[PDB]
Paper text:
Triosephosphate isomerase (TIM) is an enzyme that is only active in its dimeric form and that has been found in almost all organisms that participate in glycolysis.
Here, we present the 1.55 Å crystal structure of the apo form of TIM from C. parvum Iowa II as part of a structure-based drug-discovery effort. CrpaA.01119.a.A1/TIM crystallized with two monomers in the asymmetric unit. Interface analysis using PISA confirmed that this was the native dimer. The fold of CrpaA.01119.a.A1/TIM is the typical TIM-barrel fold consisting of a barrel of eight β-strands surrounded by helices. The two monomers are very similar: 249 Cα atoms can be superimposed with an r.m.s.d. of 0.2 Å. In CrpaA.01119.a.A1/TIM the active-site loop extends from residues Pro168 to Ala178 and is in the open conformation. While the ‘open’ conformation is typical of apo structures, a blob of extra electron density is observed in proximity to the active site of the CrpaA.01119.a.A1/TIM structure. However, phosphate or sulfate from the crystallization buffer can only partially explain the extra density. As the identity of the ligand could not be fully established, we deposited the structure with UNK atoms in the active site.
Author numbering:
A (entry chain A), B (entry chain B): 2 to 250
Amino acid sequence: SRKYFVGGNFKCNGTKESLKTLIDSFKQVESSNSEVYVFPTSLHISLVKEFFGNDHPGVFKIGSQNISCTGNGAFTGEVSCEMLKDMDVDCSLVGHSERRQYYSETDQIVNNKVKKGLENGLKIVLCIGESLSERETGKTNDVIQKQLTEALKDVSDLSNLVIAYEPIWAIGTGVVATPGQAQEAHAFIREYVTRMYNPQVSSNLRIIYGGSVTPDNCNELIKCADIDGFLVGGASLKPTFAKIIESAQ
Amino acid sequence: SRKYFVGGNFKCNGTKESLKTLIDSFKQVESSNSEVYVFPTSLHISLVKEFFGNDHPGVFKIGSQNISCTGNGAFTGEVSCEMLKDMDVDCSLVGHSERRQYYSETDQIVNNKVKKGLENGLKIVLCIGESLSERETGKTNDVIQKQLTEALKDVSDLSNLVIAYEPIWAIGTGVVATPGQAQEAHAFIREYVTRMYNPQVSSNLRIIYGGSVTPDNCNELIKCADIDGFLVGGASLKPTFAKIIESAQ
Ligand code: NA
Ligand code: NA
């Protein structure tokens, strides 16, 4: 059976003081049957590693929120896979909705980043999802197919991939996603991955839910047959992120 | 008379070990009449601060290679001015040629970033410059005017601004800029700032040269009347960056 994956995307948040307090809480988490990652900002990755230190259970690992399309060189403002590996970071998000929406990350850029990450041995959390206009006009499945076809173009091996479904339509719009709707989207993603690859590959692929996750709804969502964990937003900046990890046990 | 400014842009380069060695050299620099900044990647800022420690000569300060357009929040992959201030970083590059060229930073995004940086108390190194096609078609001045007009739109106070002129036409093209050509571009920039503001403001504004700078040419360039220091690329990842600082004495 698939090992569950619980990620905490800090986004553009954190201070030295707030992260010190938060990581002190996370060090109290004694064990997990799931993979557990937190994704601080690039500015905070080394600090967060220092805060964890060695006096912890080895439940939490650290990931990046983004990776450069290129390796080292004349890429002002960018951070490369090789730099991350030097820092002992073995995972990154790619194609988060916010980067697609705000920073001109196209499907083709996302493909480039997935390939770059996987080639450098990183675990890549590929983010996909449709907007409210797309959902309301019946294009959910068209969008998921396009995003997968393009993001995974010439990507042969999914062993180090995880897919996060972001119900963009249900984030900040006043519209709310039910667990049933989440499950339906995850089942469809898995079904398309079967077509693009095969049933063995799709059966092994973790598909994590990247909508609104809190301590109040995580236990219901994780039971859904095609939901294999979470990519958590704001709830990952609170000690009760531990309750979300516990739901995945 | 203007205080000179020597910046070292590391771009997307560095490892823990290589930076440890480099900063150990930079700590040997005993004094400078110039402002001195190094701009590591965001991943490396806290480690570079560690390596300098708390008993060095106080010659070097640390800057960022980029800042977010927005403050904290749901901006995956971005690092904000407020985050930089929390880490005691007081300076950033904005509008570097590589970000304009590769990451879709328009003049309007650059304006947004200059305003956001300055409003948060950061010293902003605004980068401008024209391409080889622009230079060869006679558009150098048109391009500089446009870039300044847009980047400084509604920017009233230039006390925390520095401008870096990047002769993009002379970087990676096989075409080489002479110090005379650099001087001519710097003089034009200052002349246009006079028109946009006034001669007091333009006489106080540092305009630093962001073309090819090494220990072999820095002494000739710094003597130029309108060249007030440097934004150095690859030469800033070597101990001999110290020789470039020394040219600005
Ligand atoms: Na499940
Ligand atoms: Na000069």
